[PDB]
A paper describes a structure:
The degradation of HIFα subunits is promoted by post-translational hydroxylation of prolyl-residues located in its N/C-terminal oxygen dependent degradation domains (NODD and CODD). These dioxygen-sensitive reactions are catalysed by 2-oxoglutarate (2OG) and Fe(II) dependent prolyl hydroxylases (PHD 1–3 in humans). The human PHDs catalyse hydroxylation of prolyl-residues within the N/C terminal ODDs of HIF-1/2/3α and are negative regulators of the transcriptionally regulated hypoxic response.
Residue numbers in the entry:
A (entry chain A): 186 to 239, 250 to 404
B (entry chain B): 1 to 13
Write the structure that this text describes.
Amino acid sequence: KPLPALKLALEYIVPCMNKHGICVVDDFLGKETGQQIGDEVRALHDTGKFTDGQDIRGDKITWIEGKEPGCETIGLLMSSMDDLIRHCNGKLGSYKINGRTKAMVACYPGNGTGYVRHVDNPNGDGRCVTCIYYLNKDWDAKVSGGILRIFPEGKAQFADIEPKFDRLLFFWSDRRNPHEVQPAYATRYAITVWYFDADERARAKVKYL
Amino acid sequence: XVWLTDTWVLSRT
Ligand SMILES: O=C(O)CCC(=O)C(=O)O
Ligand SMILES: [Mn+2]
């Protein structure tokens, strides 16, 4: 029996994020839904829908709104992420979360591709929580690499996150969590949504021309 | 159903 979403949010995600600034939920959606999402992602890849994510990053990406034909299960993943954030009921830090990005479907196509150490939102662009879902059946970093290494500020030790199938990850998007995607030696897929704090986003520190 | 609170991983099942 999977934990209900409300209980998972209030009794784990909230306290875990407030304590550590990083939170992993394994077995988020189960094997059938996870494999369905994998099929949808591989279909997007196989039909040539990705573009360069860019030296700094070697991923290939596409943005998914959730209602597109062939992306129904990705849309279900996005609505499930949204439900969890809603259940958190403003207890994630002092943020007032009111919006998010589309889903960034990303592939590191093996061959040692990765993402150098970076902060997702270093310039106050409104993004407060990074939420990533991994869909790599049988991934083993021993063989394929691709660890997400996070370097939380104020801690001497780093946190290694393998991109395991059906794994959901949250972390604060600001400077507290610099991170890198270590070289990947197999096709590594993940889906990211970023959630916005309404006030920070409204300050418009970033203008997109 | 167990969270080791010094860690940041929990399985939902
Ligand atoms: O795929 C991952 O584990 C993280 C990717 C990342 O840091 C990014 O796209 O900003
Ligand atoms: Mn990042």
